[PDB]
Structures are given as C-alpha cells and as structure tokens.
Design a protein around this ligand. Structure first.
Ligand SMILES: Nc1c(C(=O)NCc2ccc(C(=O)N[C@@H](CCC3CCCCC3)C(=O)NCCc3ccc(Cl)cc3)cc2)cnn1-c1ccccc1
Length: 351
C-alpha cells in the first residue's frame, strides 16, 4: 500500500544529459532548439505522447531562481481546458543538497496559431471558436489575478479538433510588442488585466485580414501605428498618464481621429467588427473584459456561462518578497516534492 516512487534512467541527447523516470520512453528532441531543451516522449502510464522540458540554468541567479519558482507555481495552478497544464514535475535529486535540474512534463501541444494560418484559410466559424477559447482561458487566469502580458499567435497552441491552449514559451520572428497594449508597452500607468484583451483584439484582426494589425519596429513606431487606428488620446485618458514628458510627447503629435472600424475591416462579420471596437479601446478603463467579451453576440454558437469557469485563488504573496538564491531554490524544491498529479483523462474510444 505505499506509493510507488520512480526509478530513473540516464541518457545523452544533443550533448545534453537527460535523467527521467522509466515511465517516459523514446525521448526525441523537438523544435530544433527553438523552445529550449524539450523532448517528445511516450508516457507509458497514459499511453500518450508528452513533452518533457529540462529547464535551462534554473538557479543561475536570484532572478532566474525566482523565475523558476514563479513558473512552477503558475503551472501547478492551471487547471483549465484552454490553458497549459502540468502533467508532472521531477528531479533526479534525492535531496535539496543535490538539487540542480528541474524537468517539466506537459501535453505535446498542437501547432501554433501562425502555423494554423500558414497551412489553411480560416472560416468565420473557426475565427469565432479560436477567439472564444482564448477569452475563455483569459476569464480563468484573470479571475486569479494572473495577467499573461505576452499574448501573440506563437503562444497559442491549436490541435486538429481546433481546440486551443494559452501558454508562454518565454525567452528565446513575431514580436510580442506588435500585440501589446500601449499603456503597458510605454509604462503610462499601472495597468489592468485588459492589456490581454488588447492582444486578443490584435490577434482577431490578423485572423480576419491575414495581416499583422500593428507591426511596429520599436515603441514609437508601434504607438504611431496604434494611434492611426484608434485616434490620439482624449483629455480623460491623458490625465491618467503619470509622466509629464510622456504627456508632452503625446500632445506634440499630429492629432488623429478614430477610424471607423467598419471601413477598415470591410468584408468582416459586423459582429466581429463591433467586438474589435470594444477590445481595441485606448483607455483601458473602458476596454471590454474577457468575461464580458464571452457574452458578445459574435460567440452565440459557442457561449455557455455555466461552462466558463473561474480559477481557485492563487497566492502571489511571494512576488513581493526579496529572497536569496538558496531560498528561492528551496521553495522550488518544496513545490517539486509537493506536486500531486492530475488523473488520466477520459479514455473513450470512438474507433
Ligand atoms: N515545445 C512544446 C512543449 C513544451 O515546451 N512544453 C513545456 C512548457 C512548459 C511551460 C510552458 C509555459 O507556458 N510556461 C508559462 C506558465 C504560466 C503561464 C501559462 C499561460 C497563462 C499565463 C501563465 C510560463 O511561466 N512561461 C514563462 C514566461 C516568461 C519567462 C521569462 C520572461 Cl523574462 C518572461 C516570461 C510552456 C511549455 C509542448 N509541446 N511542444 C511542442 C509544440 C509543437 C510542436 C512540437 C512541440
């Protein structure tokens, strides 16, 4: 009746040592270096393929150690159909004193939203469903006061059933900047969760037109492209920007009117145009939230409030702590050894 603890095995792949539980077999590197050190593997406990990631220099510095801890805490929290989740986390270490390596196991994700677009032309139904699922995932993460901040097509995984998950592949072409709200890009003020809604608007526009909405080359070019669509800030919004230099810069610019989006996105479903208007509002105090957006008539064939859950509370009191490297490392170790795995999925077989 004691819980089994795994036996590990060791191998080399691409000049990298991999030491993993024997349940993970046929490790094979994936993404030719793009995603970091990641292998596909067959999980013998589930009969499915998974991704195994060996973290890079997880405790290099206080910053890296806190980053490691943060990512593990977040991954462990996420329990939602449209957000990446954690299948397993392990280390070959048998104590904190020999703890150096952290491995994360996730589902093997679908191609990203760029790949989807490159390979097929999307129907309005699939645009509705893909944007719906992003918003569904955002309702969940936002309810726990978690903001993504990095939404872009490469951080959205889509499978052959058109099911979507939100993730963040992190550090090291599509610039995250192109999808970023001005107030967060430019540090105008303390921002809200609707920075992510701006990104959804930018993604939706691109799915409708086939073109990047605001492909700015730097912060000033990005701002100018944005204001050309949505118009220069009004008096109400200008008062909420803290920096006098920022305000003075903004006022130096040529006045621009808000464009009529029905002219810009001509051909698109009028409901999609109306929702884009509500997502790309410049003043983030007036921008639609994820939960509100789910109720928009554009999503009438997918929306179901009783199937759009919120998240359990997430304790982010660690974010305010200044700790030493070994303290962040020990906290990470605690999270590894406290991990409780999810149950297997339903295994109904249609053929
Ligand atoms: N390559 C892969 C994987 C893979 O790599 N899995 C491991 C993995 C682990 C964590 C995350 C991950 O998302 N972390 C997040 C977690 C929290 C996040 C989740 C989304 C909602 C908001 C919270 C994370 O913390 N970010 C780090 C972000 C970051 C890091 C550094 C900096 Cl400076 C800024 C941001 C994502 C993948 C799986 N399939 N495939 C595949 C896909 C196509 C073909 C072939 C193979």
């Amino acid at each position: 009746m004691s819980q089994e603890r795994p036996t590990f095995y060791r191998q080399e792949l691409n000049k990298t040592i991999w030491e993993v539980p024997e349940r993970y077999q046929n490790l094979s590197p994936v993404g030719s270096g793009a995603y970091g050190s990641v292998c596909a593997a067959f999980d013998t406990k589930t009969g499915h393929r998974v991704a195994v990631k060996k973290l890079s220099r997880p405790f290099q510095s206080i910053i890296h150690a806190k980053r490691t801890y943060r990512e593990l805490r977040l991954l462990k929290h996420m329990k939602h159909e449209n957000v990446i989740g954690l299948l397993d986390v392990f280390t070959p270490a048998r104590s904190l004193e020999e703890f150096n390596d952290v491995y994360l196991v996730t589902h093997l994700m679908g191609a990203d939203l760029n790949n989807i677009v490159k390979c097929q032309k999307l129907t309005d139904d699939h645009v509705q469903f893909l944007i719906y699922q992003i918003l569904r995932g955002l309702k969940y993460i936002h309810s726990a006061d978690i903001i993504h901040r990095d939404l872009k097509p490469s951080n959205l995984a889509v499978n052959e059933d058109c099911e979507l998950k939100i993730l963040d592949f992190g550090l090291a072409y599509v610039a995250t900047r192109w999808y970023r709200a001005p107030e967060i890009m430019l540090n105008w003020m303390h921002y809200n969760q609707t920075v992510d809604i701006w990104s959804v608007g930018c993604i939706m526009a691109e799915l409708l037109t086939g073109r990047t909405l605001f492909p700015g080359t730097d912060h000033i070019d990005q701002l100018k492209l944005i204001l050309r669509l949505v118009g220069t800030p009004g008096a109400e919004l200008l008062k909420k920007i803290s920096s006098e230099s920022a305000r003075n810069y903004i006022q130096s610019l040529a006045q621009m009117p808000k464009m009529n989006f029905a002219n810009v996105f001509i051909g698109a479903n009028p409901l999609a145009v109306d929702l884009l208007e509500k997502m790309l509002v410049l003043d983030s105090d007036k921008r639609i939230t994820a939960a509100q957006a789910l109720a928009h008539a554009y999503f009438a064939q997918y929306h179901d409030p009783d199937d759009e859950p919120v998240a359990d509370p997430y304790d982010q009191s660690f974010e305010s702590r200044d700790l030493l490297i070994d303290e962040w490392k020990s906290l990470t170790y605690d999270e590894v050894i406290s991990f409780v795995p999810p149950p297997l999925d339903q295994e109904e077989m249609e053929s």
